[PDB]
């Protein structure tokens, strides 16, 4: 149930997700009023989940980033996984997956060192064993698409 | 340097891009100038890149997502895969790795027989073979993290 009004929002949200309420009724055509009510609706059914300041993840400190595909070491219990590794700070995302693999994490850290001792940390606590893939350089990324 | 007012802050606006520059500088402990002038040197230097809400991709029609893994078929040409595919909007995420392949892309698309067609344009226009892996699930996704 998204209206044309929505998709405007959401778009201008995603390209600037400190735009104000005037900005964006001005664009909309609609009150400021209007604006506020249907952005809080948005929010309330799963439509944007948040907003984020972009971090340049070299900037602070993550000069290493890889994905990490992982798998069940016994997959007969059900999966914990991603609730257990949802302590670990340094998974920045986790993806279950079609294929030979079940979930794939993205994850940051400070060096070739930091990474192995996170593979541990990663096997140890979700009884998974891992395959890495680092990565060398992001041309672009999260460029979120509303059509 | 990040100096940790600069680390608090980062933190601050990782998890919440519309925190407003008034109840930024209390949990700071500073003033709405300080604070104020603090962020767009953080713009300045490349550290936030930018604000954007997070727009969850199935309720705007994007049913399935993929990490294509593409590898150039001829090694004599350039290799300008990142460059040549920027322009298909579906393609949100372009990263080069070590692995087996040459990049990993995230793709988000309408259906399975749109993603179909979406690989035989990415073969066609950069000169690649495609490997694709199929998301099943979100369980949470850029969580930035600040040391
Ligand atoms: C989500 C996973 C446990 C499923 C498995 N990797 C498959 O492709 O069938």
Known sequence: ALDDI?????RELAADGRATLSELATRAGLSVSAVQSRVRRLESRGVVQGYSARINPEAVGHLLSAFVAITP??????DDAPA????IEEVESCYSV???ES??????VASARALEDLLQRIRTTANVRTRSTIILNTFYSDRQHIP
Chains 1, 2 share one sequence.
């Open 6 to 10: 929505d998709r405007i929002l959401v």
């Open 73 to 78: 070491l016994d997959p007969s219990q059900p």
């Open 84 to 87: 257990r590794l949802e302590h």
């Open 98 to 100: 079609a294929g030979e």
């Open 103 to 108: 979930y794939v994490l993205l994850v940051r």
